Amino acid sequence: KEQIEKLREVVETPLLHPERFVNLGIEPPKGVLLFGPPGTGKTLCARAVANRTDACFIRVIGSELVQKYVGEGARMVRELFEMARTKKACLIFFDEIDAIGGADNEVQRTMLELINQLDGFDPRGNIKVLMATNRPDTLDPALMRPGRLDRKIEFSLPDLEGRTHIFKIHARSMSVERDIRFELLARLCPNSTGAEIRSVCTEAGMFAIRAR
Amino acid sequence: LRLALMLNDMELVEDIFTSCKDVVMLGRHGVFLELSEDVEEYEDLTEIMSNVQLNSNFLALARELDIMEPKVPDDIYKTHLENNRFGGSGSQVDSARMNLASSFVNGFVNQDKLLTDDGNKWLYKNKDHGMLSAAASLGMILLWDVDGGLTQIDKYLYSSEDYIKSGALLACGIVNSGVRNECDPALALLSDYVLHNSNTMRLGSIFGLGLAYNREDVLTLLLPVMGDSKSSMEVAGVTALACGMIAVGSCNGDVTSTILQTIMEKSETELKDTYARWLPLGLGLNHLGKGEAIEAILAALEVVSEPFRSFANTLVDVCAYAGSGNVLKVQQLLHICSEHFDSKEKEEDKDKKEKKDKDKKEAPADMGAHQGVAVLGIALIAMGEEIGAEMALRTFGHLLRYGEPTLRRAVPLALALISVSHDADPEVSYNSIFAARLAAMLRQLAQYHAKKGTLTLCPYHSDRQLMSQVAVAGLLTVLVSFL
Amino acid sequence: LDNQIQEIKESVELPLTHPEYYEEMGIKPPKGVILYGPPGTGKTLLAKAVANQTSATFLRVVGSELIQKYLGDGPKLVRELFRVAEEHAPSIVFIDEIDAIGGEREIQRTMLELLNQLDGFDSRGDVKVIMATNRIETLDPALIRPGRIDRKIEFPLPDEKTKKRIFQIHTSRMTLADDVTLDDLIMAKDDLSGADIKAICTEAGLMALRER
């Protein structure tokens, strides 16, 4: 409930009420950081795509940055940033930044030019930043992050009263025993990280599979 | 009973009705009993069973109302069709031709009767021949409910428009085939002698009565019909086809003064060659039922003339070779196949689908590889008589792609006859080919057409002359071969 | 075995059995599962796909030879299987023997194209795809994160009981001496879908038939 608002107030609010942030004081916020075990990763981002108001945006994965015949990745990030220029500050999503982060000069062109474009204010520097990765061992983003990005938080771990939302989005499993109660699955397993609940569906769901 | 389908004998049905009467399914053997019997042995059956009938259940059961009394309520019960086809596929109709394809829809989709009663003005916005197609469409939606047919078509009977009442009597002829109570109000007058309404009511009423039916009184009434010689083609069209469907399955045919009279009056005036195209249809229909008839040599002596009546001669050659072991006509077929005349190739070579209709292993040939595109149309029409295996659809892959509107228009017809989830994919292929009007109306005709009996062999062999004015389209929608 | 066959049965055979838990419970797993086993080749995988053939339309695609047997066709046949699978929404798509990675530069772009087309970026849940291979280590992780989001299962070593029963049935009418044992035969062979022991029983029954 808390973290979903800490990441929702930066994905929904900055576009619905732009004047509230200009008059709100310091500036409109930039974004959040999602790092840690995968668990239910990319599901809440698809929920943010389902919560789109006017125009769906284009997604960008980390695997597209590394390709054969190096030199095309720069034109790729510059052409998708150019599409962000043409689509009136379109949303840019980066998935699995660990594939290129944590510095291979041919990759240093794409990732150092990527930093030169994020930290650089030429296209724009305030639309939406958001990084979804797996391991926090990326030294270069950890030292170049406080330049423009901010609001570092946990990946999915909610408070004690916040788990029920991620269990209401994890209600899409096979079944518990029947269609009598959702809360029987939603409240009978507390104190479990947003990936430890994926170990509860994989291992407790594997126990429901191996139960004859 | 298959021996009764191949024998066409009157004693077999009596022995199988007393032997099948002693051994008491019932409605099923009545249904496919009426399906198996031809035009002769059900009227001979209705006269000997008009004499005894042995239970009152032979004309009670096996005369009418009981080949459709099991089907229609069970077809409405066991099947549940959605409305999204009427909505979308029933909403992309426009241009006064897809509306004709929508009369094809209305007539040939009858569980649900929403499009049947979707308001009014649908028949008012249509055209004359579309007024015939829409006036007869409500007759095609009523293959059951005899009592309901009179109270549904009664609104169109004797209305202010000629095509509404003529197509309404056509509807009265399509709704039933054993009621024969709607004849008198239309068959009574019949007298215009030039071009008044009762000639169109003669189209719908003589054709509808031909679908309802050696009957001699209707032929004596048909004597002033052929004697009138109206400028309209469908007069002698539905006349020759009507008396032919009356004469199919006779005892080795006949060369009587009926077809002799229509041959003499056929050769009387050599105008509007479409008469010389559809009159040999009914002639060959009277030639049907032969086992040892010499009518092909009698005609081969009596109509030796210009390629009009020689086209009649090769039509008699077509209907006179239904099929046997006569490979001499196969090598003769290959010999005469190279004739300069580009119509006796079409019909005489088109007989292939009728001759070898059973041994379909030899039916796929190299006729498509020639340059006579009309022969590609011959094979294209010859394909659509089976479930449509991968080889037939393989032929529809090459035949589906062509530039002339006659072949591009002709391919969805046999494509829909051959297949009545690989149905909508060739349709999307048509959407990729086109996106003329004939191909759109005909591709919708396929969209709603997807979802040795003479009744299934006559209507398309008569339908092989679609490449003309929209006047034929008034008869294109009333084909009875569609189950 | 019914355990691992009921989840794939309800997974890909979904819209033909018990239609009160797909939309009432709100599950919607329109991604399916990915099968893998060191024997693979479709013996127990085809034994898991035979339950879909009871009352449904089945589609059998084994191997990737039909893609690598042309100059430059590429994934066109996969697009034909995906459009006939789109027109065959109430069916089951079974792909077996995915060993394209195990010239070569086109395999990565037709496999990435298989990933892009299998994800359905502009299509809703209409058809389910089943993936099967021999070794999961040869497949790149690109087909895992977008592809598998629902459930994956591991397959243990082959079962000598079923192969021994098949060899016993095929050698029931045959004539074998006392020195011909079964343990060395079922032990020396590996990675066979059953049609290969059926093949050595066909060439062994025909080879024994040569002497009448």
Amino acid at the residue B409: R
What is the distance of C-alpha A89 from the center of its chain? 18
| A:C CB pairs within 8 Å | 28
Chains that touch C (3 or more CB pairs under 8 A): A, B
* Cα gap B370→B364, rounded to integer Å: 14
Chain B: residue nearest C91 by CA?
B421
Chain A: residue nearest C11 by CA?
A174
Chain C positions touching A181 (Cβ under 8 A) are: none
Beta strands in chain A (DSSP E): 31-34, 58-61, 92-95, 129-132
CB pair distance less than 8 Å for A63 and C142: yes
Q: Which residues pair with B62 in a beta bridge?
A: B64
| Contact of A186 with A167, CB cutoff 8 Å | yes
| B:C CB pairs within 8 Å | 10
A–B contact (≥3 CB pairs within 8 Å)? no
| Contact of C63 with C97, CB cutoff 8 Å | yes
Chain C positions touching A209 (Cβ under 8 A) are: 3-4, 7
- Distance (Å) of CA B268 to CA B194, B219, B276, C120: 18, 20, 11, 70
- Within 10 angstroms of residue A33's Cβ, the number of other Cβ atoms is 22
CB pair distance less than 8 Å for C84 and B424: no
Smallest CA-to-CA distance from A127 within A46, A4, A21 is with A21
Q: Give the distance from residue B424's alpha carbon to the nearest chain C alpha carbon, in angstroms.
A: 8
Chain A positions touching C6 (Cβ under 8 A) are: none
CB pair distance less than 8 Å for C83 and B425: yes
Interface with A, mutate which of C1, C9, C31, C151 (most A CBs under 10 A): C151
Asked how this structure was determined, the answer is cryo-EM
Q: Which residues pair with C59 in a beta bridge?
A: C93
Interface with B, mutate which of C58, C81, C82, C87 (most B CBs under 10 A): C87
Phi-psi domain of B119 (left: phi exceeds 0; alpha: psi -120 through 50; beta: other): left
DSSP state of C23: T
Q: State yes or no: A110 annotated in a binding site.
A: no
Classify residue B325 as exposed, middle or buried by CB count within 10 Å of its CB (0-12, 13-18, 19+).
Answer: exposed
Q: State yes or no: C147 annotated in a binding site.
A: no
Task: Provide CB contacts within 8 A for A13, sequence distance 6+.
Answer: A20, A21
Chain C positions touching B431 (Cβ under 8 A) are: none
What is the distance of C-alpha C117 from the center of its chain? 19
Q: In this complex, is the C-beta atom of C28 within 8 Å of any C-beta atom belonging to chain A?
A: yes
* Cα gap B162→B152, rounded to integer Å: 18
Q: In this complex, is the C-beta atom of B151 within 8 Å of any C-beta atom belonging to chain C?
A: no
* Cα gap C164→C53, rounded to integer Å: 25
Chain C positions touching B427 (Cβ under 8 A) are: none
| Contact of B174 with B140, CB cutoff 8 Å | yes
CB pair distance less than 8 Å for B425 and C87: yes
* Cα gap A43→A41, rounded to integer Å: 5
In the numeric block, which tokens belong to residue C70?
Answer: 């042309």
Q: Which residues pair with A31 in a beta bridge?
A: A129
* Cα gap C150→C35, rounded to integer Å: 12
* Cα gap B288→B310, rounded to integer Å: 19
CB pair distance less than 8 Å for A174 and C27: yes
Resolution (Å) of this entry: 8.5
In the numeric block, which tokens belong to residue B357?
Answer: 């209709």
Amino acid at the residue A59: R
Chain A: residue nearest C28 by CA?
A172
- Within 10 angstroms of residue C207's Cβ, the number of other Cβ atoms is 10
Cα atoms in the Cβ-side hemisphere of radius 13 Å centred on B252: 5
Chain B: residue nearest C80 by CA?
B425
Q: State yes or no: C40 annotated in a binding site.
A: yes
Q: In this complex, is the C-beta atom of C3 within 8 Å of any C-beta atom belonging to chain A?
A: yes
Q: State yes or no: C90 annotated in a binding site.
A: no
Chain C: residue nearest A208 by CA?
C3
Cα atoms in the Cβ-side hemisphere of radius 13 Å centred on A186: 16
Chain C: residue nearest A176 by CA?
C25
In the numeric block, which tokens belong to residue A16?
Answer: 């619905």
Write down the residue that tokens 């009565």 correspond to: B209
CB pair distance less than 8 Å for C10 and A174: yes
DSSP state of A131: E
| Contact of B291 with B252, CB cutoff 8 Å | yes
In the numeric block, which tokens belong to residue B280?
Answer: 């040999």
* Cα gap C49→B6, rounded to integer Å: 48
Q: In this complex, is the C-beta atom of B421 within 8 Å of any C-beta atom belonging to chain C?
A: yes
| Contact of B140 with B110, CB cutoff 8 Å | yes
